[model samples]
Target chain A: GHMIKICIAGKNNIAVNSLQFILKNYFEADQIVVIPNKNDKGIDSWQKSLLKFALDNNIKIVTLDEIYNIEQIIFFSLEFDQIIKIENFKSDRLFNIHFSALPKYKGVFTSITPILNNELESGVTLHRIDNGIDTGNIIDQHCFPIDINDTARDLYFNYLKYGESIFKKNIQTIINNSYKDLKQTNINSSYFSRKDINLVHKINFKKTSFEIHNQIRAFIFQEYQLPIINNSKIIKSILANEFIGYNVFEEFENYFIISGIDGFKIIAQKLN
Target chain B: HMIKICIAGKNNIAVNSLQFILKNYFEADQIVVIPNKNDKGIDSWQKSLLKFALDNNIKIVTLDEIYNIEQIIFFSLEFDQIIKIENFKSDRLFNIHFSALPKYKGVFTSITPILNNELESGVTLHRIDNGIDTGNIIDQHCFPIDINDTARDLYFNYLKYGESIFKKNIQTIINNSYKDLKQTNINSSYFSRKDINLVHKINFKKTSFEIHNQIRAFIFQEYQLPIINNSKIIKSILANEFIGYNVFEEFENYFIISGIDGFKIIAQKLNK
Candidate 1:
């Protein structure tokens, strides 16, 4: 395999560090550049670890403003929080790894919306970066079923694993000019904004038991705001395995239970 | 005009509902509410009930403060601590049980019927005895339990029935015209607090219908946690209907479980 000059750009330390390690086996240490997201203070654990790894391995670390010329740039979980334009990189081939299957779940909270909607399948898509967010030509895509018990966080870790595997397998194809990149048709494409995420935080009792369950699961990892019933906010709850069709609220020794539209019971602790 | 009525119970929707009926229909010169005590100061619902009674000029009395009470009505109050037959209370101690006597006779009566997929659930007004739910029957009201009914729905419905029965027979009880019959059907299914916790587990080997019912039943009251792969805790599940046992659709993090009749997506935790 011929050596391919590469520049890795991403905000997450794990993605940038892993890509650099994988690329190092095929390319020279001098042929690669790492552009990490600029941080002023309070760098998280992942960033600290990545910084240590870069310093120990003598890898070149630069900011977005410092990099002038690059032949190829790989975007791995990179968010464009900075004001740098991609056109300034002087790179014709820009690759990105998206957490979704493409065309679907195009924006923020991609991993959560599918689970909330009870999607049958979710995946990772490796594509060429375009102007629009998550709207790009696919180079390689791997699809996986949405398991019976999967959360947004679970799907996220899965994306990271598959993303790593596919990138490793297609390193030569990504470098060489042999693999053909397919254009995205995106017939059933949908986009979700940050504002749409508020729905996941609120529980609608009118919805079916499964729908409410999905909403709770989708937002469980984050700081979830409890749903309100009869002007009362439920702070804590225990999920029962059976539908108890009690319409009134009942308090046990510790928690309270309330009924929903479809004979679903939500045993919750109220926030007084 | 000289009747004195004392109510013993924790603060709950059922108790509050009954109180509303008693205040509107029955004429008792003095009405007192006795609250149950637990580790946590007073339960919020009980506190609310107490406040409402106090605001309405109804007397709030402790166990030691009982004076010239002629009759005691127990609405969803457990009497394991405060009063036994030796406490020198009134002979006319009538209590309301949320389930039909000789059927579900113990803890979680509001939830068990729906979980068992029983077509009917009801409430029984009985004379409080020494054993749990083993009191003599005074009046009974039955209602149909919908397939989609949750524990909350059943509980609320039970409260309404209880209120109606109490209102209809309050005059008979006051005039000593209501007859009490001893229960003949001793074959009863009882569940303890331990049984309530055990229902949270999801047995994958069970038929699709059973698993689906378990999922639905668990999701009813609170956020029911299901164990997947005998290890991972399912935070929530999503399914339109039961699809029944088939190949497990492998996803990045979890699997979509198929039952004999329906399909459910399991969203679980990663670390555990």
Candidate 2:
């Protein structure tokens, strides 16, 4: 009795691709919008997400030309060759799927930030986007519990599965105008954006095992701008997690606290 | 006239104590020292002393520089042998051994006292003799090893307890008021160097209590325990301390098992 238009915003994340598949296969939307930030000069990882979903289905893939005028595209194009400019279509519902508990962590890489921040629980947010970035009106949100050993890599896969179910269940109400959008409360008015490189590599040995452990979990798979101590020109990605019982070490400096719980370790490696 | 005190030992404790004594008791000019060439990860105190030497222009040489003046004061050796050397012209060749000399003497005296479960141990300020720790004593300070005292505890105490006596005796030597007291040959004894193969091995035949004590003996200076697990030699580095408590109060339980690397769950219960 009803049809819906689905618009998705994300890079080439597996979670985004999975969402596109579920939308096309189940809801059979009239049109599908994938807005990739044009400013990204390299191979858009999200383009692959869109390609995988579109290749398997009849969903129409909208490009920069289909959505934006020449002036806006050129202005954004100066920074990013692939600017996502949505021009004229105003729908009954516009949604952006996010991987964080809204009004909590709202920016990019939200799923890993909570763990990095040593938060106990984190979840996916499905909300109606307005003029603001992710400070959107929430339709529905669900939390997935964090296990002691769970990492950003593990959580990303977990969210990929959990988010699919959450979105599939709520997509109809969201598009049919049956759901009421609630404004975010308790928003500290101070939101965190992309974290700095100095903060990323600056490990405080003074922190308890729990804090350090969470920091490791948070940065795993989430690319933080970590600058090497001697080299400021290049940035690296580090995945932190609790060191396995055998791998754990203690010294006078660096992660040595008297009351350390199961020891945490930051496994720093080059990110390709 | 540079007074050189040659200390022979390994690990952070010795390095820490030497650094503390030299800095607080003798302001830069009064002390010369030799450290292990292979030593790494010098503690904050040791690093400070090295920096102090550099800043204050104190003349300190490595073991590599102990060329012709080897007769002045050879570390971990006899005083009579030292006195026999030609051109050995020192006002005094003093030693700071961690034990009541004539009782516990040798490389592992401090650790051996704890291993043998001795409740009382001491520090000796003695002139080098023809035999191990048989030198004429300049002064002696005895202290009781606290209950459940590890090598680390004794080392910490010795650093504090012996520092004052060491300073007073050295100053007395400078003032020529120090009198040498000969050790009665009847009460004198010495422990030979322990075979690394025999002492460090974890004999499974020993009782849990003995195994536990042996574990404690090596915890301060971690030793690698190689076990043949599943036909593969797996090395386990033992360094943590164990505590005994009621089942409900313990985070984990299980000590011994039949198979190597096979975890045995001894107890698991929630507090009522």
Candidate 3:
């Protein structure tokens, strides 16, 4: 069979490195093209890495202006801050690998939400990219159990690993046009915008100790500000071992104790 | 010539307490009471005070009706909205501030001290000036703050001390023979309306002692909800005796937070 013409679009280390390995080793792709993120800064530095790989091989990198005429485009961890008008593309197939299960957590910061909500499972979904955000036909999906102590950072890296494997497994199927599409059902579909994720950074003390603990861990991956009380920033906290009425008391010189609802004890320390 | 007295204050427990002492002790030839308009309509207690003044033949006047008054006294009156020295006809404009001057110099005085874990809390009778709580001191009184004291407890304590000091110095004040000391502006800090609201949030990472202090300060007369991560609301907290660092150990129906040297158990009912 003649080699398939493929165009890759992404802007992160995970996407760049994985695509390089898969394209160089497995596929005899004709006319390979790369579309780097439009707002690529040196912060992620994935552009440099991907450019180096492309230079080593005789691959052609195209701009957004040229992408409209491409035949097949694959989006791997691409920054979609603004909506991509996929309808403008003259491509037969537009594929995307989302870092969350279909019909759940469909938006930005997908890996962080499951940990913040204390969900039992987290997953990745491979789907067809349409005009809407993460709302398309699913090709394949892989889910894993969320550990009790996993931070958002840990879950994010885990998603990246799964993403690489899924892409590798289905590359031939995608290129050969042999993959079957499973239409997404409206079973508990939740969509989160950028503003929705912004509210997750603030800590409310009136929550259950478990909930508070989960929130702290979820934001640990990002540079979210620590929780504040009386204008002082909190550095760390722990659940206590005794039950008492709601009150605040000093145990010794600088240490203090606070009772949660139903007599939950929490030891907290302020940033000096 | 007999002394002319004008009293201005909000309708509250402190005003009632101070007015009780003033009416029973001093004999003024002319007395006028200016009750500040409150959000809550004149209640039975305030009406009783007005009725007592009417029975004693004392004139009931408004803030706009202060003319040729010899002495003007403010008890538990809000300073933010009211006009300062220009409003009073007399040079003797005295205000009873519910905090130790040179320490807490802004709003939420009764609660800020407990949250900051001050060893002592007190009341100051100062001459009203243009600045907020930066007036000259006339008669000041201090009281030690107990670690177990809540915002309500400290406020009531301030009322007791304020009433005592006002009663003891009535003779000096009436004679216009009391000495006034200029306040030192050094080490001065001001808190705004937003700062008062921020204190109600509980940061779980503070030392158990600090968090306990925050819980005590916010408990006020009612249960103030401590928001977690600015998202979850904690209904209440209980201080326990254990001490450690970030040790969140669960107990039966509650949890304990162990600080560096002590621990506090919190009874949290999630307010979603």
Candidate 4:
């Protein structure tokens, strides 16, 4: 295994802390480099803190903004596109972390897709990056079953917990290896584009219990709180797991019937 | 000993699903579907199947309209007499559940399975009583995880599978040969609506796997994935796992470096 130089190009305190932990565990905090974005207060604090720590421990930390013009070392980025822009860097082991299972689900908000879809299981996939978005070679993956009652926010944190474990175990090895990055197959590979707020919130009562349930599960969470029109201007949290079909197009025709039951509930803040 | 079948629940999918299954599968002489406002049209299904039975109707009434337990007991007694003519004793009550029983008992069985990080979860038909899903077992069935499945999937499957099972097991239940196994006391966990806010927040420090489960657990039916980037609020619903030590490092750092100041969301119009 070759000794490696580490570069982290994302802005966030958790990422900073986790990266700091990784750096401290493997190389001295002084050995890691960083670039601070002055316009962003968060990025500023992250850089200041890291710089202070590196200074205190005599570690070498670089600013990406300044070093991009001068440094010839391997660079890693938080944003997927930034890595592609690093012309001098080698692409063999350049990879990033995506938060969903590959082939089945690809793109941003991976955790939320399964939840919105009201899927039974969702997981994390560590893949080698290609030019395409999340269409790269799969390095390792893990699946976590979802509760029927979960929201995207809840499922996001759950996956994060397990994903961190898997990441910590293999980061060092990944950094040292020559990964064979593979391209994703176009067969049955689905793409989840950015969700539309207007279109996503409409709930159709005529759909089967399964479709309704999945819609609620996928969209009814922290950010994608599936809003139901109650009174004028009120989007109440539409939380109910049980759905009974009073009228269905299947089997029986042109008549109302007791179709089925979905065992969930809707909870929303009431407005008088 | 007389077999007492007590049917209890709110008037919705569960009630109707149960009635349909009983009528189509068991061919029991009498079916008492206690109605509520939501299930006003439920009787239509019963009316269609038991047309002759309706012509020589036994009894059909709403639970709310009933004045006292004496009427309920009397109806139970009458149903019991009919069972005796069919040569069966020991009355049994059952409820249709949207999740695996013992794991998620009371409210929100369908959504809770996704919230709890269950990979494969589905419907369970069991004897019902005062205790939530604690009734002696009759029959149970499970469904697979569709990547896009939601509360809707469980709701429909419970209905379809429930119909199939009830039809198949009608004779066995009437003959008093259906198993009466009790649920494992230690595995039962109940959830309520008040727990929504607590369940929908994302904790950045959790492992990817844990985050995955947490996101899926409280997914679409409960909420949407929250994405807070540089104080700009956007609801995100899709995530993927990637290879690296800091897949979520950017998200984590944004919160921490900014002194943990997250985004504020405004309540928008709720679509009807």
Candidate 5:
């Protein structure tokens, strides 16, 4: 309402839906812009294209360079591919919906980190983007269940849904400059980069079922790569509460049945 | 203008559905139940419809007794025997099939969904005709079958979503205002009791997910558990983590097994 252009930066359904929500409810088509992920061909497939949505809706398409100098713009990132430099922005109003709860899983592959760390829950966080990666002051957060059997793909989808809700809930406050914030404590703070994850997963069955199952599920991003076991790709990994003895392993025609040091059961499914 | 509702079948779905009808629409006198023949007013892992009906002071009747009731509404939830339209006096017969019909029509819905590696399953409300689960569909509620959910878990979810769909569409069903369409011939499939062998054979020749599914699909602890190497498996934990190729090891309480895909599967024995 105050002659401001809000830029939604990112890709996939999250960016597209967020752009649509903002355009439909709060802002006019002219008052909103989008910076789709770098490689967006505007071709829709399993994922809706943000660029295509913006183009068809008559909303302007922008880049980080174009919006960098706009003093009246609010920068919001939703699953944006590239990390941004706060120094390049003219506005102090940069915001993002980071996948994990801040103070933990602060970097890339937010879906993979928490489940891999044997976490039973994860959350989406809305924060004012600072100089660090997901190291920002919190605005709002919504925690949800990460069921015992959730894969990275499922967790990623939950992020999209919860992220959008958080965005919608706080965006108005952000626009009105009435939102409260809190600094993240260093006690539980952690971070990871692209280099931190190894897509080629090696199952260390020598550990407990919790650890082994987490390892397998953390890398199960079918769009990218599934964790590799014995030179075969795994589509799913399930860890059950039932325990076996320690350090047991077996192989047949399609899967490996195993137990870890703690004797809990683990089953790694092959991606055939 | 008196209307009577009959709840026919077994399990929590039937019991809960009867309670729902009793609470929302009818009194104990206006309702009757035809529980599964095997239910002897005994409580097993699954709830018994007969026990519920008897406990609530609801009348217990046979399908034959209700056939001549002109203004009766027959609702089947996990009912055992398929029926004939000519046997009933009223044209208002409904059933909530477990699968996403016409994809799955016959019995063993809990096992079939997992064995087929389905990521989701649904409860379909339809007008019960002469054919098995082949009815004009009125409503459906599809829900996720988590990556690690076994046959029992799938069944439990079916009961839950099944009840929800019933509650959602019950008013329309009562008012006779609901419209329905015939199930399509395409993608329609069925598996009868004969089609499933509770004594499952481990076909490790398939993918890890497939093999894991084979084992878990048969795991209904109250009914029967799958057997591997003559040992009954209580749970199968699968992961994409490849432990090793052609590996097989027997522990005191579990079997660490891998198929040709090299994905890890830990089959926990029933009573270690």
Candidate 6:
């Protein structure tokens, strides 16, 4: 009964960029609508706002209730700030592109979790959204590298870039309902709630250089907070494969050089 | 109006939970118990559920005795038996599983989380299903697994929080007013009896945290303790003090040690 063929819901650059890609390639403004996340203020910052893009392009901005009756809708949630009640919608085409690889990092703070856990890679997953938080059957996934020194901020940007690209790559199949998906298994599945992490970090020096570096980099979001070492706040942590010495920790004006129990080298740069 | 509530399982989690219910919801006549088979009605490091029930004059009943009780509330806390839901006439069977549901679902919950290097653990109360810890979760309470916490420490933490969670949600569960959601396969995990080797092979070729976790994971005195240099380690005290990398020195009672990572470790030897 509704005119919406595709509804892009969520905030930030991924939502904005994906909307742009759709307009340029497939649907016009009339066939598409958006429901921006509540925190979006229709203003751009370090990240572009989906609300602002929608308003500027004259695309209709709508609520979730407005499209519930739409029979053949494709509801694409890219970090939508809602635990959707699947029963309320008439459509079974609800999809989400979560930040982490499937069966891992099912909850919030996706960028920080994998790094803090000392993961070598992270991913973006396209899946059919059920009632649970990021616990859905996977349609597709794009696993990408996480450099040894990659900070949470850097990882977040990669998610946005890769997320948009994956959306562009899979939107047509999603619309056609032609994509194959399998049920997520119990093995290797992990999750984190909002309560699971604290943005304000405390470095445990009694760890490996990789883990200690991970601890520092995982919290280096800049927009949020950074890990504090001694009294100075750390903005970056660079890990080296070479061993420096046994139990070496030295502080300078702008940085601190340290080696954890493994004797691997780490240089933590302090924020000015 | 005979007994309408059944408490099944072992240790203080079950005993204290029974106490909370007896004091608030039911009396001795309105309740029955099915303590674990290993519960010899003798108190050890943990308070015995069987002893508590016998002392308090609560009836001891088998699973079959309560099968036909249509409205009976059957709850298990640390129960050793895996129940078949089809055998029961009542649909109100519930359980409080150790570790976060959909993760650490099987045995040795205390050891598994640490070995896998998890920072926290949770208690999940759910409707019992035929599958192991695979049920619709009614409520959950998660607490931190502090870095140095041994299996005993984590176990005690569970007993404490498990009692609180039981008390907090008992009213809704009893009234049948509580809503529960089916657990997704994502992040769900299990460890069988055979998965853990009681005699741990301490891998010195790991991070300090990994080594520390290894020692602490097996520190359940009644069960086992990790051995180092022919001495059974009673406690592993990992400190931020960077003593040296790959340092291993033997003492009469304690060893000054460090893993591949350079952090300080004081492994307290056990002698009995």
**Each prediction's DockQ?**
0.01, 0.01, 0.01, 0.02, 0.01, 0.01
- Index of the highest-lDDT prediction: 6
The TM-score obtained for chain B of candidate 6 when compared with the true chain B: 0.96
Tens-place lDDT digits, model 2, residues B124-218 = 88876433455678888899865445555666666665655655665565455779886542223344443233235544332222233343444
lDDT of each: 0.57, 0.46, 0.60, 0.45, 0.81, 0.84
How do the residues A14-35 of candidate 1 rate in per-residue lDDT, one tens digit apiece?
3554556565676666666666
Tens digits of lDDT, candidate 1, B22-107: 56754434566664454233345234555555556666677566533445543344333424444535666667777876567666
Error of 4 at A192 (Å): 14
Chain A of candidate 3 scores what in TM-score?
0.77
Docking class of 4: incorrect
Which stretches of candidate 1 lie above 4 Å from their native place? A1-4, A13-17, A39-49, A72-86, A222-241, A246-259, A264-272, B1-272
Candidate 6 local lDDT, B1-272, one digit each (tens)? 38789999999989989998888889999999998889999999999999999999999989889988888999999988888889988899999988887677778998999888788999989998766676789999999988788999999998888888899999999899999987643344456676689899977654456678888999998888888878888888877665555678899999887653356778899966
Query: Between the candidate structures 2 and 4, which one is better when assessed by TM-score?
Result: 4
| Clashing residue pairs for model 2 | A11-A46, A12-A45, A12-A46, A38-A82, A38-A83, A39-A80, A116-A218, A216-A240, B79-B128, B79-B129
Give model 5's docking category.
incorrect
Which candidate should be chosen as best, given TM-score against the real structure?
A: 6
lDDT of 4 by residue, A1-272 (tens): 22335655444332355466667676655446664333334323412343344445555555545444443233444322243533434434455666676655565566557655445787676676555556667777788887655656667766556666556656766756744445543322434545523334665543333434444445544344444433212222343334322223232222112221222233333222
Q: Lowest lDDT 10-mer window, candidate 6 chain B? A: B183-192
True contacts kept of each: 0.00, 0.00, 0.00, 0.00, 0.00, 0.00
* Candidate 2 similarity to native, TM-score: 0.37
Model 1, residue B104: what's the lDDT?
70
Docking quality level of the chain pair in candidate 1: incorrect
| lDDT (Cα, tens digit) per residue for candidate 5, span B1-272 | 35489999988888888888888888998988898888989777778888898999998999888999996999998888879899988999999999997666677899987876677899899998876776789998888877667899888889899989989999898899999987653345566666688898876544455667788999988788988778999888877575654357899899887654355778899885
> Per model, how many backbone clashes are there?
59, 10, 71, 143, 40, 9
